[PDB]
């Protein structure tokens, strides 16, 4: 009887952890979208700790976790001292690109635009730091679009017009648009819905 | 309108964080009680991260947080290399004793027994590590019961019978009994109740 009670408790804790993960992911996407970067930092710490206390994950929760990891690496995209992979040469934007091409999601025009913007910026942030050999290394791992980028790396022109047309802000805004579609999908999660009900009843 | 929507969202996130804090505290007390120390470690990481994302706390939630901090220091009671206070001389059991005498709770016989057991053990764990000068330092900060303890410190008798009568296990068991009263009080929290309902409907 006491083994079954402990079992019911563990099952209930697994249900609550799954709800908390969904809420933390929604909150992280919202923070990314609003540019509230301190909230994104704190919520990322919370989502990571919650995931370490989970054992089973549904496919939707794994997809959810991958999106949160992508956003974390995009936010750390200019932080070339961040190591997101066991391979220490993989820059944050290269790490986000690997997740982007691995999430089970539709490959619509927005998916491709974000992918191409991340590739250009993975190079541009190396040029911006003066790491011209590292931009060349990044380029060989990611790659007509290709020939212009290699030309820029060899010419060492960091503030090239191409990097302004396909800028970091353009990349962020397109990722924000995608995040808006994800934010609408599960603004319908249990914790968020129940919290919203409480708020609306106190008005 | 968009400022009010952001406001409603922040209020709802504050309601959800408050529910998650309550659930994590219940889960931490349960882990302490069952002696599932890896779960206690992981859940303590989760409760800390959640609290860093909260701004307002009700009195009941502060009391709740204090109990969780006490349990963490009791579990780290034999870890003399743990620093829980800005004063680096305060040992984990001395740190738990300060919280125990600071929680707004009834001072029943169990409260006093736990207090006296923590005081004896704050000394005993220094003797067990061979830190006889540090046991003397701990003794002066905490303190007929007093004269026996000072006699033991000066006699350097680490494996004294007094430390077996008022042992670490006796201290843990009495704290576990208290934790059982706390665990029954808010096994009634929102997240836990709703998770239990889902589990019972899938049986
Ligand atoms: O900062 S990172 O991108 O590196 C990051 C790491 C781990 C995380 O969760 C633990 C984990 C989930 C899945 C597989 C294995 C570990 C993250 C959850 C959300 C957001 C970011 C996360
Ligand atoms: O490991 S410790 O005991 O040091 C500890 C520290 C901080 C914590 O939360 C952050 C915090 C809450 C209240 C005031 C300021 C900070 C803890 C929450 C639960 C359990 C333990 C915690
Ligand atoms: Ca680097
Ligand atoms: Ca596929
Ligand atoms: Ca020490
Ligand atoms: Ca008082």
Q: Ligand 2, closest atom to CA B72?
A: 3
Q: Is residue B200 part of a domain?
A: no
Residues A121/A132, Cβ–Cβ less than 8 Å: no
Which tokens in the block code for residue A78?
């200019």
Q: Is residue B87 part of a domain?
A: yes
The CA–CA distances, whole Å, from B92 to A74, B95, B182, B188 equal: 40, 5, 22, 31
Tokens 């998916």 belong to A111
What residues make up the domain containing A170? 2-201
**Among B20, B41, B44, the residue to mutate for chain A (most A Cβ within 10 A):** B20
**Among A16, A29, A39, A201, the residue to mutate for chain B (most B Cβ within 10 A):** A16
Q: Does A54 touch chain B (CB under 8 A)?
A: no
Burial of B46 (0-12, 13-18, 19+ CB in 10 A): buried
Chain B hits for A196, CB-CB cut-off 8 Å, are 8, 12
Radius of gyration of chain B (CA): 20
Residues B117/B127, Cβ–Cβ less than 8 Å: no
Q: Is B47 touching ligand 2 by the criterion CB < 6 Å? A: yes
Chain length of chain B: 203
The CA distance from A59 to B170, in Å, is 46
Q: For the domain that residue B151 is a member of, what is the CATH number?
A: 1.25.40.210
The CA distance from A50 to A52, in Å, is 5
For ligand 1, atom 3, the nearest C-alpha belongs to A69
- Which residues does B97 contact at the CB level (< 8 Å), separation at least 6? B115, B118, B119, B122, B142
The CA distance from B83 to A78, in Å, is 35
Residues B115/B100, Cβ–Cβ less than 8 Å: yes
Experimental method: X-ray
Q: Is residue B149 part of a domain?
A: yes
- Which residues does A98 contact at the CB level (< 8 Å), separation at least 6? A85, A90
**H/E run at residue B60:** helix B59-75
Facing residue for B12 by CB, picked from A19, A53, A192: A192
Residues B27/B19, Cβ–Cβ less than 8 Å: no
Residues A55/A25, Cβ–Cβ less than 8 Å: no
Domain count, chain B: 1
Tokens 């990722």 belong to A175
Residues B33/B44, Cβ–Cβ less than 8 Å: no
For ligand 2, atom 17, the nearest C-alpha belongs to B48
Q: Pick the closest to residue A27 from A37, A35, A39 (CA basis).
A: A39
Q: Pick the closest to residue A95 from A77, A79, A110, A111 (CA basis).
A: A77
The DSSP secondary structure of A77-140, one letter per residue, reads TT-TT---SSSTT--HHHHHHHHHTTSS----HHHHHHHHHHHHHHHHHHHHTT-HHHHHHHHH
Question: Largest Cα–Cα distance of chain B, in whole Å?
Answer: 74
């Amino acid at each position: 009887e006491e083994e079954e009670d402990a079992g019911l408790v563990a099952e209930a804790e697994a249900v609550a952890a799954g709800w908390m993960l969904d809420f933390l992911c929604l909150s992280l996407c919202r923070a990314f979208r609003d540019g509230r970067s301190e909230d994104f930092r704190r919520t990322r710490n919370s989502a990571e700790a919650i995931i370490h206390g989970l054992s089973s994950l549904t496919a939707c929760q794994l997809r959810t976790i991958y999106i949160c990891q992508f956003l974390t690496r995009i936010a750390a995209g200019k932080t070339l001292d961040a190591q997101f992979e066991n391979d220490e040469r993989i820059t944050p934007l290269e790490s986000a690109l690997m997740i982007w091409g691995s999430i089970e999601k539709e490959h619509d025009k927005l998916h491709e635009e974000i992918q191409n913007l991340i590739k250009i910026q993975a190079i541009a942030v190396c040029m911006e730091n003066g790491n011209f050999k590292e931009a060349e290394e990044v380029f060989e791992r990611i790659f007509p679009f290709k020939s212009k980028l290699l030309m820029i790396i060899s010419q060492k022109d960091t503030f090239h017009s191409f990097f302004q047309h396909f800028s970091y802000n353009h990349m962020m805004e397109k990722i924000k648009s995608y995040v808006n579609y994800v934010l609408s999908e599960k603004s319908s999660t249990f914790l968020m819905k129940a919290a919203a009900k409480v708020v609306e009843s106190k008005r």
